[PDB]
Ligand binder design. Structure first.
Ligand SMILES: Nc1ncnc2c1ncn2[C@@H]1O[C@H](COP(=O)(O)OP(=O)(O)OP(=O)(O)O)[C@@H](O)[C@H]1O
Ligand SMILES: Nc1ncnc2c1ncn2[C@@H]1O[C@H](COP(=O)(O)OP(=O)(O)O)[C@@H](O)[C@H]1O
Ligand SMILES: Nc1ncnc2c1ncn2[C@@H]1O[C@H](COP(=O)(O)OP(=O)(O)O)[C@@H](O)[C@H]1O
Ligand SMILES: [Mg+2]
Ligand SMILES: [Mg+2]
Lengths: 69, 498, 466, 50, 468
């Protein structure tokens, strides 16, 4: 509900950062977003709000390597 | 397929214990992931034991030095589980099942979960088939049957690991899949065990599950439950060994005292209330959970079995300590190894006077049952007559006769290392000893007499060995066909030699 | 009457309820799982505002910190009736045999009940017919009184209890309740079921006439602690109906250990050597419901595992405080194949007095003890002296004592597995007659090994003449 | 028997090696794929997708 | 970086850091301390709100709360390489000898490294000749295998270690590393410097082939707690490049004791006798790095102090499972002036197997233990009643056992000050021959007084003949 976090490989999304900040009001209200780079992460989908997360950019790849191995 | 996964933040990480803050809807023994971050390319799993309010203290299965405050953790819904199947035979693995021998990935298709309820109440069956340990003392006086829990308890260095490894080695063609779980054992010692098993070709039916001393207390805590899961799957589904479907498993817990110490460490770091000797309250519960899973399923449930051989070291032979008494109460038998007997030449070093096998005769071949009663009685009488042997000189040849015969039998049990004897061998030797055919042999030469008689029996007459082995299961073992051609061989050896 | 789980630390669960609907002290909690299976947790402490600390009595490997909890209002209710007869239960009264569940029409009773009042105590004490010669003679078995089989390992405690159940179910018309307190699954499950489904009445089986409650060693400490009270409730139902009942508790030592574990897990301060503070009262709550009421009597036979030879250990000490008769098993006797390995000496009973058992019983039972105390001081002399005959009449006394010692052994019907001998039952009148005749002199002129495994002195004579 | 066991172990080693190398080269492929044409709203669309 | 001290509990310093710049678990944080010299603390536990708990590894008795703490961001890194040979170091790797500091170009390695994997373990083992009769016969040392000498306070652990160094540290075929943790700064070092600089293998002293880290008892708990790891980091570099390393760690028990003190200050719940709950884990972390791997071999030779004469104490109890050859020193034997003081019955070895050490060696050792056992069994019988009530063969075995007890005594080159006799180097073959002859019956006529402080059996025979 609060203390949001959105990490992606390519940072500096400019307005998109602000668009994310205003659109994360979907659940409850105000959030405090913090952005990270994490260069080893190939693609950015990590969004955390409260005690939930969603990410399938490194983790689609992780599911792939679990499938093959 | 992106999906929401509940997460929490690490708020306090200490000596292998991490407090995870908000992990609502987390189950009481989940695997928490600690996903990779900068400076760590892997994931360090952990077990969420303490589900406290506004805090989940989880023990870490690995090095915690990479886990930092504020790090993220994902509550994977899966309970702790290990890979299990045919592919593990002859592979050294950690409790998580990842191979550590560097021979390649473990090939598997099923992953049984560790921490399973015992097989059942009415699903078991009376232990009848023997586990031929290959040691005369164990196989004759403290027999071990398939599905029995037999503790190997002793001092710091008496032969507990040696006894267990000899047991494992003797199951060459006996349709048994041994499992050796090393808990808190130094890595080079597990390497020595693996080298010994590979030298005798015993690594083609053995699984080694090692959690060594440096590995975190969490890994050692789950060390016996892993491997126990492998034995459970072997007894329930079976694995193909030598072209035959083997549904019998033997699991050796290298040292349950070290397992209890690891559980004490992880309990005290979680600030759980102590107990006797600073052990947690549910340590008997831990070991009973572990050891009640070893059973002998009835024919309705597969007919398989899982034999457990817990090992415990006692400080100064203090049997009355907490963990030794717990596992003595749990197990269906005890094998007491003493340093006083070990140094005195009794190389197996078993204390037959106190060692007990509650399965008793039911875990023996009918030949062993028919032959070993006189042995046990005579040894008990000799043990009763102790002082008289050693400096009373005014005894008749009634006390002294028992002293002599008991010394004969005790010297008979002295056996070297890595030289197991099949069932027919022990039957023949004990038949010779208990039918007065060995009386004239002097005391110090009895080990050589036994060895020479066996060599004569391998070479001079293999037909008598085959004859003994074929009809070791009949109710009246000393059949006239067997009594003849066995007494005849004994007489031939007596006349030819000495 | 619904709360939520707050903390889960091992097998101890802390649950918060509404302020006005807090469960009572020993109420059930009944955490519901997915498939209709549930987790009954017993409350142990009411603390704070609506918070209750409860012991799991189950795995607690599948629980979250928000699961609803369904307070039952009453303690752990257990089936009691004719329908609980011939079945196998766990601590919670749920059947663990393969048969179907107990129907709702069967009465359920709370596991915790007050013992009979001091007025209801029946002071009239009479011997309970056992069947085993050494037990019937040396340590007579009271009706409605507690007896304990003491000993270490491979001593025969469980097998002796098994024989007692089989004999008193067959020859008497006696029901029995078995309390598997900390029960080994190998021993308790498929050696008690198997050898009581083999012990057979006429068109009826001994298993069908007995109740079995197994709190196995794999279950948490709470289950092992309260399985004894479950079995007590089962037996107390039949006692209330007027039937004489024979309760059996296997290794009350493990009951004490379970109590110690529960107390340690609950945060109570340790007492003596780490044991629970509520040791004596925990044992009393169990041992005082076993007594002879005017209407009926629960006769009990407890097994006690003494570590090493330490009788100062808390479990044997508390039992001894709560006992009427004591039976001591020795490994030395057992290793000589005297398989009912009771030690005649160091096996006492308060019933063994002239008034209760009888003048002849007391005389013939006190002679054997003396005769045998003489042999303990002369077995060893004949060992050292190398001279059996250097004895004016102590050579006769030694022979008679050896015959007596061999005579105490008896083939058990439940031991047909071990030795393959039919089980012989010996009434107490036959026991006193046999030992009186042996002491008279009839036992002479018969060599040893004819007294080895025989029921009566008549059986010994029949074996001799043949 | 041990020769065949080591043969299948070598096969498993090779399968693990090729499976891991597939991903290790796909890392370069996807990194360069996102390097040049990294201006895709699909990412942001996935962020808002939930 | 740039934290502040919150609390100062003994040598456990609690420091608060910025929320996003907290140190890792084993990073080394520094208090400036003024005067141009710093106090290096090692983090142990990350508490809440950037709060960490660090072990001082120094005096920490003149520093206030709120003092600045600087996070180095890396664990305690110590120099490694040939530059460390012939030098003497602190727990921190700072040299404490008169020579200059180690230059920046020398590689620095963390002291907290993972131990060798299971695949890297070296199972090969062969006898290591020491020249000491009781050690070479009853518990033969392994080349590349861990061994430890257990003993109380007065028994001769350090003298055994010193004689061992004087015996085997000349023919090294490699380098060596010494680690006197929590040991006396008198004998533990600065008296071993004298002998290590007095010994000259070949134009170079034994000291010139030795790395040396002390952390003596005078030091606070942190130094004694991490000096073992510093020494192991020094030795591991040489092991990894193939050089055979001789590792002498002194009183591993003070490592465990310093761990216990630090744990008590850290707020952990005590385990057993006031010991840290993480006793086994710390012990394993130290000892699994003491291993001979495939790349190179480490011939470790430890010493262990048992509280008083207690052998069931948790520290030696955890040590016993971490060894290939165990040696037990008894107070009673030392009080009898049988000063090597090794108890043959309580001393064992893994390579006491006829395939490795030889069939005759194994037979003689096992017979010398059987005979020793017989005497321990008859000890009370002899004590109260007397020697005459035993049978003839029991009497003979008792006399032979007493002769064997006296014969394990051996003068040492380093112990020449106590016993005036010069030191004797007895090869293992001569030890086996001597004890085989003693058991065979030879030397029965000799009084037991002539087996005291002698070399091989030939010296005993010569002494008897000189006495006629
Ligand atoms: N017949 C024998 N049986 C057992 N051990 C023997 C025998 N003969 C020699 N030994 C030696 O005795 C020692 C037995 O110890 P082992 O390695 O089996 O472990 P342990 O006594 O259980 O103790 P730990 O593993 O804690 O050191 C080994 O040195 C073994 O080589
Ligand atoms: N007739 C008998 N009565 C009792 N025990 C017997 C008898 N015959 C053999 N035994 C031995 O007793 C064992 C059972 O011991 P048990 O009484 O179950 O446990 P405990 O050691 O606690 O008494 C059997 O497996 C066997 O070894
Ligand atoms: N070979 C020996 N000859 C004579 N005395 C010895 C010998 N070895 C040890 N000692 C005695 O042991 C004492 C030193 O013991 P030490 O090695 O310092 O043990 P610790 O280090 O445990 O104190 C000396 O006083 C000395 O008398
Ligand atoms: Mg071992
Ligand atoms: Mg029992």
């Amino acid at each position: 509900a609060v203390d949001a976090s959105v990490t992606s490989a390519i940072e500096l999304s400019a307005e998109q950062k602000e668009r994310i900040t205003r659109e994360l009001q979907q659940r409850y209200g105000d959030v405090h977003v913090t952005y990270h780079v994490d260069p080893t992460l190939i693609g950015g989908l990590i969004i955390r709000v409260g005690d939930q997360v969603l990410d399938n950019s490194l983790r689609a790849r992780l599911s792939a390597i679990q499938r093959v191995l | 397929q992106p999906r929401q996964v509940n997460v929490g933040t690490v708020i306090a990480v200490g000596d292998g214990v991490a407090r995870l803050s908000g992990l609502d809807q987390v189950v009481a023994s989940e695997i928490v992931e600690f996903p990779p971050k900068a400076g760590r390319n892997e994931s360090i799993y952990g077990i969420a034991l303490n589900l406290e309010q506004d805090s989940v203290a989880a023990i870490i299965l690995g090095d915690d030095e990479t886990i930092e405050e504020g790090d993220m953790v994902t509550s994977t819904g899966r309970v702790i589980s290990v890979p299990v199947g045919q592919g593990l035979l002859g592979r050294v693995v950690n409790p998580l099942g990842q191979p550590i021998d560097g021979k390649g990935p473990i090939v598997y298709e099923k992953t049984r979960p560790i921490e399973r309820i015992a097989p059942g109440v009415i699903t078991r069956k009376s232990v009848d088939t023997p586990v031929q340990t290959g040691i005369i003392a164990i196989d004759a006086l403290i027999p071990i049957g398939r599905g029995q829990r037999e503790l190997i308890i002793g001092d710091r260095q008496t032969g507990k690991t040696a006894v267990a490894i000899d047991t494992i080695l003797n199951q060459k063609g006996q349709g048994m899949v041994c499992i050796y779980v090393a808990i808190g054992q130094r890595r080079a010692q597990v390497a020595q065990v693996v080298g010994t098993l590979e030298r005798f070709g015993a690594m083609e039916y053995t699984i080694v599950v090692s959690a060594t001393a440096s590995e975190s207390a969490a890994l050692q805590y789950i060390a016996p439950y892993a491997g126990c899961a492998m034995g459970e799957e072997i007894m329930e589904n079976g694995v193909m060994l030598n072209g035959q479907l083997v549904k019998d498993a033997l699991i050796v817990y290298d040292d349950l005292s070290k397992h209890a110490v690891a559980y004490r460490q992880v309990s005290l770091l979680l600030r759980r209330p102590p107990g006797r000797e600073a052990y947690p309250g549910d340590v008997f519960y831990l070991h009973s959970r572990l050891l009640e899973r070893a059973a002998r399923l009835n024919e309705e449930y597969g007919g398989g079995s899982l034999t457990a051989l817990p090992v415990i070291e006692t400080q100064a032979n203090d049997v009355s300590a907490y963990i030794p008494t717990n596992v003595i109460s749990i197990t269906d038998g005890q094998i007491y190894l003493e340093s006083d007997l070990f140094n005195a030449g009794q190389r197996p070093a078993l204390n037959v006077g106190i060692s007990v096998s509650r399965v008793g005769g039911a875990a023996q071949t009918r030949a062993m049952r028919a032959v070993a009663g006189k042995l046990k009685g005579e040894l008990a009488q000799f043990r009763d007559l102790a002082a008289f042997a050693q400096f009373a000189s005014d005894l008749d040849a009634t006390t002294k006769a028992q002293i002599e015969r008991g010394q004969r039998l005790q010297e008979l049990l002295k056996q070297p290392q890595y030289q197991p004897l099949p069932v027919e061998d022990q039957v023949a030797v004990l038949y010779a000893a208990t039918n007065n055919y060995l009386d004239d042999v002097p005391v110090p030469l009895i080990t050589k007499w036994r060895d020479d008689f066996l060599a004569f029996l391998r070479t001079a007459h293999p037909e008598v060995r085959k004859l003994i082995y074929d009809n070791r299961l009949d109710r009246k073992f000393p059949t006239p066909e067997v009594k003849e051609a066995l007494e005849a061989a004994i007489k031939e050896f007596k006349a030819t030699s000495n | 009457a619904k709360g939520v789980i707050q903390e889960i630390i091992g097998v101890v669960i802390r649950a918060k309820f509404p302020e006005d609907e807090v469960p009572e002290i020993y109420n059930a909690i009944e955490i519901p799982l997915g498939n209709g299976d549930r987790l009954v947790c017993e409350v142990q402490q009411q603390l704070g505002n609506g918070v209750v600390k409860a012991v799991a009595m189950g795995s607690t490997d599948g629980l979250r910190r928000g699961l609803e909890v369904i307070d039952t209002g009453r303690p752990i209710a257990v089936p009691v009736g004719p329908a609980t007869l011939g079945r196998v239960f766990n601590v919670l009264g749920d059947p663990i045999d393969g048969m179907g569940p107990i129907g709702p029409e069967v009465e359920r009773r709370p596991i915790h009940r007050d013992p009979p009042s001091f007025e209801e105590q029946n002071t009239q004490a009479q011997i309970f017919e056992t069947g085993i010669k050494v037990i019937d003679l040396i340590a007579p078995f009271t009706r409605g009184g507690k007896t304990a089989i003491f000993g270490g390992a491979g001593v025969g405690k469980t097998v002796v209890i098994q024989e007692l159940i089989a004999n008193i179910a067959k020859e008497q018309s006696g029901f029995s309740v078995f309390a598997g307190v900390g029960e080994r699954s190998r021993e308790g499950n498929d050696l008690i079921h198997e050898m009581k489904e083999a012990r057979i009445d006429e068109n009826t089986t001994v298993f069908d006439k007995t109740v079995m409650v197994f709190g196995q060693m794999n279950e948490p400490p709470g289950a092992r602690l309260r399985v004894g009270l479950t079995a007590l409730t089962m037996a107390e139902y039949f006692r209330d109906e007027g039937r004489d009942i024979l309760l059996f508790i296997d290794n009350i030592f493990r009951f004490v250990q379970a109590g110690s574990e529960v107390s340690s897990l609950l945060g109570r301060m340790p007492s003596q050597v780490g044991y629970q503070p509520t040791l004596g009262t925990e044992m009393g709550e169990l041992q005082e419901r076993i007594t002879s009421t005017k209407r009926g009597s629960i006769t009990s036979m407890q097994a006690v595992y003494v570590p090493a030879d330490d009788y100062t250990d808390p479990a044997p000490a508390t039992v001894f405080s709560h006992l009427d008769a004591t039976i001591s098993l020795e490994r030395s006797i057992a290793e000589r194949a005297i398989f009912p390995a009771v030690d005649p000496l160091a096996s006492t009973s308060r019933i063994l007095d002239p008034n209760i058992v009888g003048e002849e019983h007391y005389r013939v039972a006190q002679e054997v003890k003396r005769v045998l105390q003489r042999y303990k001081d002369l077995k060893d002399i004949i060992a050292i002296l190398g001279m059996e005959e250097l004895s004016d009449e102590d050579k006769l006394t030694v022979q008679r004592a050896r015959k007596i010692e061999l005579f105490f052994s008896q083939p058990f019907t439940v031991a047909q597995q071990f030795t393959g001998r039919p089980g012989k039952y010996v009434p107490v009148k036959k026991t006193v007659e046999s030992f009186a005749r042996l002491l008279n002199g009839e036992g002479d002129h018969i060599p040893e090994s004819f007294f080895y495994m025989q029921g009566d002195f008549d059986d010994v004579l029949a074996a001799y003449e043949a | 028997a041990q020769a065949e066991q080591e043969r299948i172990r070598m096969l498993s080693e090779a399968k693990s090696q090729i499976a891991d190398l597939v991903t290790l080269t796909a890392s370069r492929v996807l990194g360069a794929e996102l390097q040049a044409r990294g201006h895709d709203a699909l990412i942001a669309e996935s962020l808002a997708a939930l």
